[PDB]
């Protein structure tokens, strides 16, 4: 049996997206919260229709389709998908994932009837990844310098923000943040990091060291 | 079954940290309040992601790892840890504490399924001590 | 009126796209005529820098979402 | 039977190291060339004594010892090392690797007699890695800008050199080179790359595009 | 003579293209050598504003008609 | 047998294009008039050479090629094209449409010999659409 | 059995490229000289790594990939390629041409073992054409 | 003479180390007395910036190679 | 009074340490509170050159004797 | 039975350290003189408290602890230490060396009762080496 999400929670989430934006960690946490139980295509579609504006909604439809297509390629690459079955008669078409299949168009009850739990969780993960892509797309690290009067924690916050909210792979953020701490961060802190008797191999360790030995002023 | 923390409480706590700072006794009291029920690694990780800035979040990840490593050393020093079991097959690895083990990465439901209550309270106490360290360090 | 919408000299492109899609979808056009009109309004409105940016598209853009994505990628940061 | 390396090749390699330096790719290629056949500890030791100065030679002795110690730790962690044997009587001590064991000190003939081919190749790989470490140590990408009068191929050469000869992981060089092409490379080329109707996802493709559409001047 | 044709300081681009194509096609060149010559004369004649406009073409123009279309699109209205 | 168009009509049409322009409805009507009987590639090519200036003629050659390529794509998408035949040996190549095929280059008589009426009407419609495109583009 | 090229010849060729440039006829003659025996992907890759700067090396990798792709298209267009075999099990993938296939990555001995002489000569001709393209492009 | 070697105000550290190790190893000292002398000459020569850099070493450096590596890591880039 | 002791601009560090340890041990503090107080007074008194010298200690100093030894090693000879 | 050192000798040694310094050979000779009979931890501790200033005394406590720890490592590396016994019940802990063990804290008589002569000579040699280290370090 299908139960809709509370319009109160949806209104609160919409106002959160309206004030904080799409990319804030609080907004992503709230979306993860409302993305806890496996949702039917109807639920996610209406949710994104309500919380997102028109242009972000178009972008999100595109991204969701692309991610679902990647999922269906992986599904035809492995007959053991939790959305698939063992025989060929349970193969899952994109009409069944997007809610376009027979007996599902516009009807959430029938949707909940015919859909598999693996189908639901795959749709949900796809929608979450698409939301992440669109949020990263809707709103330069190598141009960030520590100002002459700026403190170091503000500079570190700004730099980590710009590096993590960029187009770099996830495995290339820490080395870039370290090497930007070393070459930016005006020459007093540059020499402070250079003359480190220990080897600092993490942005957190560099931040701790600099905060300990910084010139109080 | 996993239930997320209210984004309203999280928003209020984030604004508290924003105005009062990390070290005020009211902020530590609020953190203790939102640290009442044993949280899953997913919950604490997202909470610190939201309430802390980028650099304090990096520092907190470091400190949390160190404290969890101390906990795991004490656990291998005593087979009667509320996170451990009696046999060797229940020994708790850091992948299970940080939420990196199999069946847990990114999934809070599976996390809540496989985790022990002793595991949860140990993770929670470790995160609280790490928050205290980072707060004492930032200012 | 959708046919009177221009991208202001100082307006960003996402605001212009929002306003245009709003006015086109909330109008008297048939549902099957909104996407071509939105595309052809992106091409002829949207002041000549973005006009030339869309014109010199090595790929063929056949959807408002694709045009928006392309323009957001290659736009002149300012 | 031990055969020494030609002093003519060694003299040419020494002059190469003297003019080009320790870190040039031509120098590393020449070292790889003279590091082709498995060398005895005597050979590599004398080679580094001749081609390297005193201080780089001290650094190289240190690094070679450390790498050989890592090798011996891996050897005691696996009894199937091509330097080891099956029984415990064939376990290889560092005195046998550094040429300090009995019947080997100062005598290359006896050295070649008692040493294993696996021992030789392990010593050789260790010495090569130590040479790489010392070369990287003896002599900043995020500070590289394209000068107002500099051409683009010179800027690209300098940037790729400084990025590949740095402390970044191998999987983080291409994204960094791309994002440095985009943010450095003074605003004419910045706008030229920004308004690319195609998506450029490789430094070579960016270089080709810019060379095609650059402002001839 | 085709190799002596320059775009005057005040002349428009369509007049220059007409004159150049006329002089190149009504000359002693083989038929298979007219298009490359017309292109390379568009690139080296056609005073430096249009020269830089053709140089900084994100797409590769491989036909006199395509070059003419591109220049007519992105030309400096004056 | 090939019969050329009157140079008097062509001169009048050229002066019409010279005074009224390319886009006037009277000019398009006159072009439709002189585009009544199916013309051979030689006829249309010389007609556009005479009535159009050099730069519009280059643009028109480009547009005509593009439209003929679309026609040939539709032809390979349907073996029942009035230019095609039933077997594969009657498939129409662009060398036969542009008049570049064997036995046609520069010779209008041989052109009229080997060409099909469907070929002629397709070439004519393509040339008309290309003229419309260039006229809309020039001004 | 794989034998490496002399570092003396490679050093002389690198200095030739450094003083004369990429496009001089003497440089192309020297490259043709060092391109006489069919080289393994390892050999050509290291050779271009040493003689070319970073940016020309990136350009050359691009051009070499494109030319090898054209070769593989011609190979799937003709089952009688000296790199191909008669059955479908000998069809040559780009991982085998670029040296990325199984048993070849980083190992020149295994490379020389599994590669065909037709494969080697095709790789060599592709690399030579790519060098010509990059030399014509750089200056 | 090894005991007269000083690091010049403008000289780099690797040149000074090369010169010092050369003069110490090509001298009349016993082989077992070269490393301690090289270390104690690194510490007392090698103008006071590097002197303080070696003095404030959280680790104990017991080899000329280790001292050279440490100084090359933490040296003042200039 | 121990909490009023500062290292003078011209005073050496061993004299300051002697005076501070004297005043702290000859005071009303419990015996278990003297070492932490002496350490935290070394860190906050002892004019900013030595303050920064103690701050940038690659090792953790957890005893007044260790702090004194470290400072005496790495002090600015003057 | 414990007999204290003469305060006259201690006063003379303190004035020697005050005028000649810590490193003079006469001072080291005087210390060796007053370090002739094996002293109890109480004796050496009070002696260094009197003759050394506060900061050298802190340094000396550190160095004495380190040297005693090296001694205890050598003792656990050899069960035939003159401070150790044959069985495991005579193993000497650092609380017994520094005078911190049970029945010894603050009482020199009980100290002299329970301590071994090997313990006394090891403590004495450790204290002498620590004094040498601190003297070499202070100036």
UniProtKB/Swiss-Prot annotation, chains A, D:
Annotated region (Involved in capsid protein dimerization), positions in chain: 42-50, 103-114
Protein function: Self-associates to form the irregular polyhedron core composed of hexamers and pentamers, that encapsulates the genomic RNA-nucleocapsid complex. Assembles as a tube in vitro. Binds to inositol hexakisphosphate (IP6), which allows the assembly of the polyhedral capsid.
Record-given protein name: Capsid protein p27, alternate cleaved 1
Organism in which the protein naturally occurs: Rous sarcoma virus subgroup C (strain Prague)
Positions marked as site (Involved in capsid protein dimerization upon acidification): 167, 179
Full-sequence range covered: 249 to 468 of 701
Signal sequence range: none
Places the protein is found: Virion
Subunit field text: Homodimer. Homomultimer. Homohexamer.
TM stretches of this protein: none
């Amino acid at each position: 049996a299908w139960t809709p999400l509370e319009p109160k929670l949806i209104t609160r989430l919409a106002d959160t997206v309206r004030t904080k934006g799409l990319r804030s960690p609080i907004t992503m946490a709230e979306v993860e919260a409302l993305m806890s139980s496996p949702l039917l295509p109807h639920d996610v579609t209406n949710l994104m229709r309500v919380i997102l504006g028109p242009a972000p909604y178009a972008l999100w439809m595109d991204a969701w389709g692309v991610q679902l297509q990647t999922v269906i390629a992986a599904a035809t690459r492995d007959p053991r998908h939790p959305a698939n079955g063992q025989g060929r008669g349970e193969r899952t078409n994109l009409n069944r994932l997007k809610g376009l299949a027979d007996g599902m168009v516009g009807n959430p009850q029938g949707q909940a009837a015919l859909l598999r739990p693996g189908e639901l969780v795959a749709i949900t993960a796809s929608a979450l990844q698409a939301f992440r892509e669109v949020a990263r797309l809707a709103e330069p690290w190598a141009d960030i310098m520590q100002g002459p009067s700026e403190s170091f924690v503000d500079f570190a916050n700004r730099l980590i923000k710009a590096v993590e909210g960029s187009d770099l792979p996830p495995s290339a953020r820490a080395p870039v943040i370290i090497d930007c701490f070393r070459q930016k961060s005006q020459p007093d802190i540059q020499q402070l990091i250079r003359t480190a008797p220990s080897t600092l191999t993490t942005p957190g360790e560099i931040i701790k060291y600099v905060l300990d030995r910084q010139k109080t002023a």
